[PDB]
Design a protein around this ligand. Structure first.
Ligand SMILES: CC(=O)N1CCN(c2ccc(O)cc2)CC1
Length: 115
């Protein structure tokens, strides 16, 4: 509260560390469904069903231009990629399995880097 500060966690390297994690996810062999925005004109259902599309290239642009206020907003967008993937794809499909694999991959890098 006013004039009562909790001790300050060091956040000076967050930007660099999120960029590294993003690079590792970009180069994972199962990243291909998530590298670019889904083509809303060519994929039936997607525009109407998925209220907030997100993909790795859009995350990269936002990180490179100061559009994440902090750590957690970056993590919310990464998770959104995988939450959208589960909404639109069967668990037993290549894309569905790619999604589950990439989420598991991210969450371990996230824990090891920050927790
Ligand atoms: C990431 C994701 O959920 N998808 C769903 C469907 N997909 C697709 C693309 C082209 C096409 O002709 C038919 C399906 C794009 C990726």
């Amino acid at each position: 509260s006013m004039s009562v500060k909790k001790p300050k966690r060091d956040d000076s390297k967050d930007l660099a560390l999120c960029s590294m994690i993003l690079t590792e996810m970009e180069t994972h062999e199962d990243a291909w469904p998530f590298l670019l925005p889904v083509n809303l004109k060519l994929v039936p259902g997607y525009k109407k069903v998925i209220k907030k599309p997100m993909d790795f290239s859009t995350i990269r642009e936002k990180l490179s231009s100061g559009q994440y206020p902090n750590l957690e907003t970056f993590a919310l967008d990464v998770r959104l990629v995988f939450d959208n993937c589960e909404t639109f794809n069967e668990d037993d499909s290549d894309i569905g399995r790619a999604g589950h694999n990439m989420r598991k991959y991210f969450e371990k890098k996230w824990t090891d880097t920050f927790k």
